[PDB]
Amino acid sequence: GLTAQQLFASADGLTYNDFLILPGFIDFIADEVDLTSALTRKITLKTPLISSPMDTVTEADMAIAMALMGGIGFIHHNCTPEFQANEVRKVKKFEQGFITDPVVLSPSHTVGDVLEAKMRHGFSGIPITGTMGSKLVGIVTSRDIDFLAEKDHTTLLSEVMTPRIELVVAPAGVTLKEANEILQRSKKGKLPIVNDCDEAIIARTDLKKNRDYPLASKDSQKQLLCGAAVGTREDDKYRLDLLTQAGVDVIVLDSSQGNSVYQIAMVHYIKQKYPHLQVIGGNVVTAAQAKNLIDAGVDGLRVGMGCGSICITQEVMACGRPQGTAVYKVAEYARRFGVPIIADGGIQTVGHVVKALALGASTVMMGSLLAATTEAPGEVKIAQGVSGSIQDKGSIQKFVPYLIAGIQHGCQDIGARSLDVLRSMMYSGELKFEKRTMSAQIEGGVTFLPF
Amino acid sequence: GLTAQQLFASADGLTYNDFLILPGFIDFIADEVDLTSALTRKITLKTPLISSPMDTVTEADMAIAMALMGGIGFIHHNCTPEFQANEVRKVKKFEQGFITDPVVLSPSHTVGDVLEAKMRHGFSGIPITGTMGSKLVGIVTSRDIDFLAEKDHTTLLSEVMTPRIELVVAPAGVTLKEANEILQRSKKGKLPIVNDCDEAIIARTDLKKNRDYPLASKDSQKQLLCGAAVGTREDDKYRLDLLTQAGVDVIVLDSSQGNSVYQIAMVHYIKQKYPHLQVIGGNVVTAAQAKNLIDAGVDGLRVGMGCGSICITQEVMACGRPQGTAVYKVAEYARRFGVPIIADGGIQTVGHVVKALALGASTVMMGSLLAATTEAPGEVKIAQGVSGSIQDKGSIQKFVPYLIAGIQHGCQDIGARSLDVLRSMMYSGELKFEKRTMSAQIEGGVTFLPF
Amino acid sequence: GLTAQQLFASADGLTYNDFLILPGFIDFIADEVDLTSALTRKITLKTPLISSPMDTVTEADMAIAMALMGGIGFIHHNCTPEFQANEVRKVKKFEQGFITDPVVLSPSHTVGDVLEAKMRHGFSGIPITGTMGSKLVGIVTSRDIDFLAEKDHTTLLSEVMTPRIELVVAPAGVTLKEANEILQRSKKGKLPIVNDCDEAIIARTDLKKNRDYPLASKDSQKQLLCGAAVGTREDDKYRLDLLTQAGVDVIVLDSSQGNSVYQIAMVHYIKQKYPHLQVIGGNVVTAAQAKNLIDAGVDGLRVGMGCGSICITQEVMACGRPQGTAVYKVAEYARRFGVPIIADGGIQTVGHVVKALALGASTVMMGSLLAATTEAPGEVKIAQGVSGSIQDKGSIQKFVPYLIAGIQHGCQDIGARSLDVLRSMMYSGELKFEKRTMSAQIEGGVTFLPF
Numbered sequence A, B, C: 001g002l003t004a005q006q007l008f009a010s011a012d013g014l015t016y017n018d019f020l021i022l023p024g025f026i027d028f029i030a031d032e033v034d035l036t037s038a039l040t041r042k043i044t045l046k047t048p049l050i051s052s053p054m055d056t057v058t059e060a061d062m063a064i065a066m067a068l069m070g071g072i073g074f075i076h077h078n079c080t081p082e083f084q085a086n087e088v089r090k091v092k093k094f095e096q097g098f099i100t101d102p103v104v105l106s107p108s109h110t111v112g113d114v115l116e117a118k119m120r121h122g123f124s125g126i127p128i129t130g131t132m133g134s135k136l137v138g139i140v141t142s143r144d145i146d147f148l149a150e151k152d153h154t155t156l157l158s159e160v161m162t163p164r165i166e167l168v169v170a171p172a173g174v175t176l177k178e179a180n181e182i183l184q185r186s187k188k189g190k191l192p193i194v195n196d197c198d199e200a201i202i203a204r205t206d207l208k209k210n211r212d213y214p215l216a217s218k219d220s221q222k223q224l225l226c227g228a229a230v231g232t233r234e235d236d237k238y239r240l241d242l243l244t245q246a247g248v249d250v251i252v253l254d255s256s257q258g259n260s261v262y263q264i265a266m267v268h269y270i271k272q273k274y275p276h277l278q279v280i281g282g283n284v285v286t287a288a289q290a291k292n293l294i295d296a297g298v299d300g301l302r303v304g305m306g307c308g309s310i311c312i313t314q315e316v317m318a319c320g321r322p323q324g325t326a327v328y329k330v331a332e333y334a335r336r337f338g339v340p341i342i343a344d345g346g347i348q349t350v351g352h353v354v355k356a357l358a359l360g361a362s363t364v365m366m367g368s369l370l371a372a373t374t375e376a377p378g379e380v381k382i383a384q385g386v387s388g389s390i391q392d393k394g395s396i397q398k399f400v401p402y403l404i405a406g407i408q409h410g411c412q413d414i415g416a417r418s419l420d421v422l423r424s425m426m427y428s429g430e431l432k433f434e435k436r437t438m439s440a441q442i443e444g445g446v447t448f449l450p451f
């Protein structure tokens, strides 16, 4: 076949469908290939898959799911800054380990107020001055509240709490694993971490979820990694603070055409106000474009212009690049400076994901391929997109594993035991390509139900 | 408008789409109308809706769901008798109240065996001679087993059980509400009901589910009502016993054409071997047909021939009846002997359900309208059906409430405050009808998403 | 429901799809219903089904098949009279019992001539003056000829015949059953029936075929009943003789509109030149039309005008009648004089056949429904038909039994144990009908594969 360099020296407009990969020597099982990949210069993920920040794709629910499956979710603009910050708060509060700021109450409150807290925040389990300085009086939970009816709005916590002397508690200074051990071998669900003066909390739901989700992408504090997209205008500097107060780990600068003085200024702003925050540059399709955002200190580069399944940018603008050529030509340069690429748009099926991953992309952000799932949101001003529709596609819980299995099988029967080794062979020529004619693409095709 | 008698005196082939109902005097809210209806002569349901016993509709999962929503599910033939009995067992074991036959173990077993029981039967909580005579040694549960790894298959229950002296227990003789009270005000999930000699169990999951499902159709023992369809041949008499050992409450005799000596013999067999079982006659579309099955002592009558969304019986047979005319003409006679009718086939939307309910049907069985949901099964020999397909329709949990809301709104704006009063007015003329021409049906029609 | 008289008193244009039959009391198995029916006043058939004489439906092969399945075949006009007579000869020679005119040879012939006879006539087994007066010299057959190669065209029958002294033979005067017994208990295939002077033949193939085809419609001489369609012009009187020399049993007078002086003249000609030949009148759709052909002495009446699946007669002519109304109104009168009716055109599926049989038709003739089968032929001048096409439909051997099964099931679940009792009930009101609206026909409908 043809090496990547020889394939892309043709100067043709090679998208993904314009070439294939010649298979290799299988030497391992379909479940042994490692999918480890980097979302950012200082964030590593188990699943290279990402969810694109669009109004009908990525909100708190999709971010929760995609962080549980080892990926990540980026939240969108079509909402108020307060709404975006609230969604990020939900994402980071889904699974938390140390519950350092419970929904605390004072013994003067009422079971009706406990029910109100259950509705508004979701938790029926809340410890009972009503601040993070109160020596425990007790705890309330579903098993203390549930049977009460017609009397909740008139019953003090006095009649239903658990007096602390009956509680099991732990000291302030024990590590998380030790607190988990004390919780596990206490046959109870909540272990308040208390100070020597008797003034955080760890739950069992977090451990059950750690069981249920082996690949969940968690931070150093056992909270789901979350990201957010911040614009380039002046107003964006209040949105950025309102959200970074929520602790977003990575931000993608949202812009159709990335290379500009404006995004460079926004970078120089972020990388000087919050030096520990990780940034992703704007959509570039050229090494000359990416040079500026790399010199600006950016840690990752979104790649793709006009190749979206919902994007008519080429039609309306006469600018862009073929998807696969852009991805290869940009990643071959970004790789020189440790900057992950993200192939955005153009991905219709798992073969496209595998092609993009082999072409240099350290991760892959997808849009419409993830839309219409049960977790997705919903049930002059020249335009650049179409208000399309997609058929129902089920839950991410069932869908993402299909993609992971497909990528692993592809790596198996292409001969790569890891997504790093795959790229190594590609950049060393041990992996081979061949172009496809329209008749060949016709040949390679055809009630289909993969699961 | 036209009374029901005057409408059906026309002798025309009036299906549901061939007439409408003139609205009346609204005097109440959309949520005040009562939907109480009888599935059988001695079974009353909260939701008149039923799920038809077909290979791609009704299995254990669908029956569980439809019993939770106040309806009922009938299990099909396309499987072994053992499979059908197992499915009925699952349905009756989903929510049980008194757990009279737990998955009991002996202290000589192993945590690996507890995990095996969790996988095969589903419960991780099981009490520990290992029979229903053992004085309790302890109990095991997720909070006793979960943290164990690489040692489960070599650890006796000695290291992990809860010694009984630490357990809370109750005496044998307390009523279910008292046992529930002791469980609720003990802050624990399992209360073994023990004899005075210290040799059943009630869980908290049943009470949580009773909270979550107010309208769940439960028997006198707090187990979901379940049904099964048994044929008419000689072999069916072993299937009938193998399933009635599971405690099916109601049986529908499955046959295209009901009136026959064969179904009469099967009736006379059931109603003399298991006199307490309730039977539903075969598909009849005529009062003369229904006379025989009524005199045979049957308690309910399935109605509908050739009107199924997947049925080509008229095309292949030249026999049947128009759906609405059959339903009215048969129910007007069955009503004379307290026998509920079931309108089967011909129902595409909620208006059809409302029409059938107004026409006399005490309940309504549906096929394709419920197919393709997340809960449904799957992902010469002259034929009478087609292997069709349906688009995804989501979960029953979300779908059935749409139907209940629609039927309630229909009753509201037709002026009926209950499904009994609706039928009373219909049979007394206070409810009025009018025929529709093809142009009128064209007029009354038209991206649609009801929820 | 509605009696036939009340249904057809509506004066509407009721085709088959415009009403249904209400079911009744099943009292027997699906294979117990008798399908005996009369093709003509003096021909009774086991299978009411007939094949219509059209260029693309009925030739020798189709007639052979449809006579084997208990029906009959009528041969067409689109060919020379010699061709039609030859086709009838093939039909009557397919299975023959007494082979009274074998392909006889003289011992001076050659094995090459035996092969030539095998190719031209089909039989490799022929007895060896070479006329029906020769005292047998021997017989030749595949087992005497097959191994010979490169020498067949130069070998006399002397080297290969079976000398008569080695043959088993029977006397002239034995009945067919006795000769068959002698053949069966002789362990050989051909038994020459010889005169006392030692000057017919029976094969084992005829007995094997009598085994394989229990319902085959055979004449009094064990030859397949065959028919032919003869025009009404002057030239047709030579075609009639050229074919009646072949022994056609029944003739259908082919004409779009039957009632005319020309067809009456043709009747009066046939019924006076060949008084033993049975005739079928021209297409009538009215009792006033049928009166003339009945008084002309006709023995059967083809019914149907403009209702063919390939006929545009109404469109081009403004004349005809609705199919079901015509069939009922004509058969109710013809029945008065023992004349079978034949419902032609309008039968799309088995339900149509059942409806027609219930309506009075003693038989039914089909066109396109039988076209495209493996047995069918092929692989100003105002027009009245269209050169349409049909999808492949398999062999008659498999397809006819499906129709028998369907008609029998229809009779079962409509409550008729015989096609005579069905008609008797219909004419006495024990069978009931109901009209269908367009919405009802829409309801009763829907990858379908009946076998």
Ligand SMILES: NC(=O)c1ccc[n+]([C@@H]2O[C@H](COP(=O)([O-])OP(=O)(O)OC[C@H]3O[C@@H](n4cnc5c(N)ncnc54)[C@H](O)[C@@H]3O)[C@@H](O)[C@H]2O)c1
Residues within 6 Å of the ligand: A231, A232, A233, A234, A254, A255, A256, A257, A262, A283, A304, A305, A306, A307, A308, A311, A313, A345, A384
């Ligand atoms: N990459 C793709 O495939 C693609 C294609 C089309 C659209 N999109 C997405 O749709 C959106 C379109 O981005 P956009 O750049 O058009 O929107 P934008 O909000 O960044 O800006 C819109 C217009 O204002 C300009 N602008 C940017 N920052 C400005 C500032 N601070 N002051 C003044 N003008 C400023 C832009 O150059 C552009 O002309 C983004 O979400 C983009 O990612 C993506």
Ligand SMILES: NC(=O)c1ccc[n+]([C@@H]2O[C@H](COP(=O)([O-])OP(=O)(O)OC[C@H]3O[C@@H](n4cnc5c(N)ncnc54)[C@H](O)[C@@H]3O)[C@@H](O)[C@H]2O)c1
Residues within 6 Å of the ligand: B231, B232, B233, B234, B254, B255, B256, B257, B262, B283, B304, B305, B306, B307, B308, B311, B313, B345, B384, C026, C029, C030, C409, C412
């Ligand atoms: N009413 C409708 O809308 C409709 C239409 C078509 C099919 N169906 C369903 O499809 C199936 C078809 O039922 P069916 O009656 O054809 O199937 P079946 O298994 O009851 O019997 C098939 C055939 O055998 C006969 N039969 C019945 N019991 C028999 C016995 N004990 N011994 C011998 N023969 C016996 C029947 O009369 C029929 O001819 C059923 O599930 C029926 O409900 C329903």
Ligand SMILES: NC(=O)c1ccc[n+]([C@@H]2O[C@H](COP(=O)([O-])OP(=O)(O)OC[C@H]3O[C@@H](n4cnc5c(N)ncnc54)[C@H](O)[C@@H]3O)[C@@H](O)[C@H]2O)c1
Residues within 6 Å of the ligand: C231, C232, C233, C234, C254, C255, C256, C257, C262, C283, C304, C305, C306, C307, C308, C311, C313, C344, C345, C384
């Ligand atoms: N039954 C149906 O639904 C239907 C409808 C249309 C056509 N067909 C078939 O197509 C063909 C059409 O028949 P057709 O009557 O048009 O053809 P035909 O050859 O019988 O006669 C054609 C014309 O000649 C006339 N004619 C017939 N015999 C005559 C005679 N002896 N002397 C003088 N004139 C004579 C007829 O009246 C007609 O005008 C037949 O095979 C008919 O059965 C059937």
Ligand SMILES: Nc1nc2c(ncn2[C@@H]2O[C@H](COP(=O)(O)OP(=O)(O)OP(=O)(O)O)[C@@H](O)[C@H]2O)c(=O)[nH]1
Residues within 6 Å of the ligand: A095, A096, A097, A098, A176, A177, A178, A180, A202, A203, A206, A207, A210, A214, A218, A222, A223
């Ligand atoms: N309470 C609690 N403990 C956690 C959570 N996540 C990890 N831990 C604990 O932190 C330690 C990490 O163990 P791992 O097996 O590596 O856990 P993991 O979350 O699957 O993997 P990592 O994210 O790589 O740590 C153990 O003591 C875990 O019980 C969490 O969400 N809640």
Ligand SMILES: Nc1nc2c(ncn2[C@@H]2O[C@H](COP(=O)(O)OP(=O)(O)OP(=O)(O)O)[C@@H](O)[C@H]2O)c(=O)[nH]1
Residues within 6 Å of the ligand: A093, A094, A095, A096, A097, A098, A099, A101, A102, A103, A122, A123, A124, A125, A126, A141, A142, A189, A203, A204, A205, A206
């Ligand atoms: N109580 C509490 N839980 C929090 C908070 N923030 C995040 N969580 C997470 O809430 C998750 C579920 O804990 P709980 O709400 O107690 O769940 P539970 O044990 O099923 O309790 P109930 O909701 O009473 O049924 C855990 O993963 C916690 O990390 C917080 O402020 N308070």
Ligand SMILES: Nc1nc2c(ncn2[C@@H]2O[C@H](COP(=O)(O)OP(=O)(O)OP(=O)(O)O)[C@@H](O)[C@H]2O)c(=O)[nH]1
Residues within 6 Å of the ligand: B095, B096, B097, B098, B176, B177, B178, B180, B202, B203, B206, B207, B210, B214, B216, B218, B222, B223
């Ligand atoms: N443990 C347990 N108790 C139950 C169950 N169903 C009902 N009960 C108890 O039986 C009594 C019935 O109370 P209801 O409010 O009528 O319960 P429901 O199941 O919603 O309604 P019904 O089915 O009409 O009894 C109460 O004491 C319930 O707690 C069940 O599944 N499990």
Ligand SMILES: Nc1nc2c(ncn2[C@@H]2O[C@H](COP(=O)(O)OP(=O)(O)OP(=O)(O)O)[C@@H](O)[C@H]2O)c(=O)[nH]1
Residues within 6 Å of the ligand: B093, B094, B095, B096, B097, B098, B099, B101, B102, B103, B122, B123, B124, B125, B126, B141, B142, B189, B203, B204, B205, B206
């Ligand atoms: N233990 C037990 N439960 C049963 C049995 N049959 C039905 N159940 C039902 O199982 C349901 C769930 O109870 P549990 O198994 O305790 O569920 P849980 O409290 O979530 O406990 P885990 O399954 O250990 O997580 C209840 O509604 C019981 O009625 C049985 O034989 N044993």
Ligand SMILES: Nc1nc2c(ncn2[C@@H]2O[C@H](COP(=O)(O)OP(=O)(O)OP(=O)(O)O)[C@@H](O)[C@H]2O)c(=O)[nH]1
Residues within 6 Å of the ligand: C093, C094, C095, C096, C097, C098, C099, C101, C102, C103, C122, C123, C124, C125, C126, C141, C142, C189, C203, C204, C205, C206
């Ligand atoms: N020999 C012969 N058979 C005839 C004739 N007319 C009809 N048949 C039929 O031919 C059919 C087949 O008989 P055979 O020709 O002997 O068939 P076979 O036994 O397979 O013999 P081979 O053709 O030699 O293989 C029988 O059903 C006969 O009735 C005729 O003139 N001669």
Ligand SMILES: Nc1nc2c(ncn2[C@@H]2O[C@H](COP(=O)(O)OP(=O)(O)OP(=O)(O)O)[C@@H](O)[C@H]2O)c(=O)[nH]1
Residues within 6 Å of the ligand: C095, C096, C097, C098, C176, C177, C178, C180, C202, C203, C206, C207, C210, C214, C218, C222, C223
């Ligand atoms: N050689 C020969 N004998 C036949 C044929 N048909 C019937 N026979 C004989 O004639 C007698 C009639 O027996 P049946 O059982 O009535 O035969 P069938 O053809 O199945 O039925 P029928 O047509 O009613 O005579 C028996 O002696 C048969 O062997 C035939 O095609 N060939």
Ligand SMILES: Nc1ncnc2c1ncn2[C@@H]1O[C@H](COP(=O)(O)OP(=O)(O)OP(=O)(O)O)[C@@H](O)[C@H]1O
Residues within 6 Å of the ligand: A125, A139, A140, A141, A142, A143, A144, A162, A166, A167, A168, A169, A188, A189, A190, A191, A192, A204, B187
């Ligand atoms: N540390 C503790 N020591 C003693 N009792 C406690 C402690 N924490 C909570 N409790 C009380 O005992 C129960 C401990 O179990 P847990 O906190 O998991 O309850 P829960 O949330 O109701 O369980 P579930 O949600 O699974 O029904 C609580 O319901 C509660 O009222």
Ligand SMILES: Nc1ncnc2c1ncn2[C@@H]1O[C@H](COP(=O)(O)OP(=O)(O)OP(=O)(O)O)[C@@H](O)[C@H]1O
Residues within 6 Å of the ligand: A187, B125, B139, B140, B141, B142, B143, B144, B162, B166, B167, B168, B169, B188, B189, B190, B191, B192, B204
């Ligand atoms: N009657 C009892 N008295 C004392 N301890 C009990 C009793 N029944 C069970 N236990 C032990 O204490 C716990 C009681 O809570 P429960 O039975 O609901 O646990 P669980 O099923 O693990 O809860 P969950 O499934 O909601 O996490 C069990 O985990 C168990 O091992």
Ligand SMILES: Nc1ncnc2c1ncn2[C@@H]1O[C@H](COP(=O)(O)OP(=O)(O)OP(=O)(O)O)[C@@H](O)[C@H]1O
Residues within 6 Å of the ligand: C125, C139, C140, C141, C142, C143, C144, C162, C166, C167, C168, C169, C188, C189, C190, C191, C192, C204
């Ligand atoms: N009456 C007879 N007596 C003795 N031999 C006979 C007689 N008729 C035919 N034969 C010879 O013996 C064989 C008798 O069997 P039969 O006539 O069925 O042969 P066949 O047609 O070759 O059989 P098949 O076609 O099944 O292979 C013939 O092949 C033949 O040459």
Ligand SMILES: O=c1[nH]cnc2c1ncn2[C@@H]1O[C@H](COP(=O)(O)O)[C@@H](O)[C@H]1O
Residues within 6 Å of the ligand: A052, A053, A054, A304, A307, A308, A309, A310, A311, A312, A313, A344, A345, A346, A347, A365, A366, A367, A368, A369, A384, A385, A386
């Ligand atoms: O509204 C729009 N107009 C044009 N391009 C868009 C729009 N919204 C998102 N995009 C881009 O198109 C991508 C979607 O690619 P997809 O995975 O093929 O759906 C996004 O990740 C953005 O880069």
Ligand SMILES: O=c1[nH]cnc2c1ncn2[C@@H]1O[C@H](COP(=O)(O)O)[C@@H](O)[C@H]1O
Residues within 6 Å of the ligand: B052, B053, B054, B304, B307, B308, B309, B310, B311, B312, B313, B344, B345, B346, B347, B365, B366, B367, B368, B369, B384, B385, B386
């Ligand atoms: O396979 C089949 N052939 C013909 N009728 C069927 C078949 N299966 C089920 N039916 C009938 O058709 C009904 C389905 O009606 P639906 O609600 O309109 O789908 C069932 O309840 C049965 O009465």
Ligand SMILES: O=c1[nH]cnc2c1ncn2[C@@H]1O[C@H](COP(=O)(O)O)[C@@H](O)[C@H]1O
Residues within 6 Å of the ligand: C052, C053, C054, C304, C307, C308, C309, C310, C311, C312, C313, C344, C345, C346, C347, C365, C366, C367, C368, C369, C384, C385, C386
């Ligand atoms: O060429 C034609 N033009 C008009 N009618 C025809 C023609 N050929 C046959 N017919 C009639 O149409 C019938 C076919 O009916 P079918 O079974 O519905 O195909 C035949 O039996 C004839 O009565």
